Structure 1
Amino acid sequence: AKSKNHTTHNQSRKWHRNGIKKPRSQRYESLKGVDPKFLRNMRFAKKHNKKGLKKMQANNAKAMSARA
């Protein structure tokens, strides 16, 4: 009652029945898996960007609108 053990015949055709897909769409790449010291940099940097960016960027926008 010996049977056939292992083969890869008729496998690439089944692969190309449905058109093997690149992931092909990653805009704004995922952030997990990155250095926790770098994350302790980046999250505090982002929340202080949210806090203290108003007046200097506002005056710079006024200055570049006056100069351009």
Structure 2
Amino acid sequence: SKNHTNHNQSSKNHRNGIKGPVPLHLHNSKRGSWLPALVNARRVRKHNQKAALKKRRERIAAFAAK
């Protein structure tokens, strides 16, 4: 009343194929990594965002003036 087999399983698995892995640049979360480096990275990202806002404002002013 208890039987085990692996007969049809490979065919079933390959019907809709073995899907490949997600590219490494996606779902690239950093949670659980080394905290001392994580904190410094966060500070640098904040500075970068401020810089991007300033750059856009400068672009807008230049286009308007000339």
Query: Shorter-chain TM-score category?
Result: 0.5 to 0.7
User: CA shift at 1:13, angstroms?
Assistant: 0.3
**What residue in structure 1 maps to residue 14 of structure 2?**
16
Structure with the higher helix share, 1 or 2? 2
User: CA shift at 1:4, angstroms?
Assistant: 4.3
Report percent identity of matched pairs: 51
Mapping for residues 1-68 of structure 1, pairs under 5 Å: 3-31=1-29, 32-51=31-50
| Separation in structure 1 between the aligned mates of residue 27 and residue 2 of structure 2, nearest angstrom | 45
Q: RMSD between aligned alpha carbons?
A: 2.6
TM-score, normalised by the number of residues in structure 2: 0.57
Which runs of no fewer than 5 residues in structure 2 stay unpaired?
Answer: 56-66
Which runs of no fewer than 5 residues in structure 1 stay unpaired?
Answer: 56-68
Higher RCO (C-alpha under 8 Å, 6+ residues apart): 2
Q: Which runs of 4+ in 1 moved over 2 A?
A: 23-29, 49-55
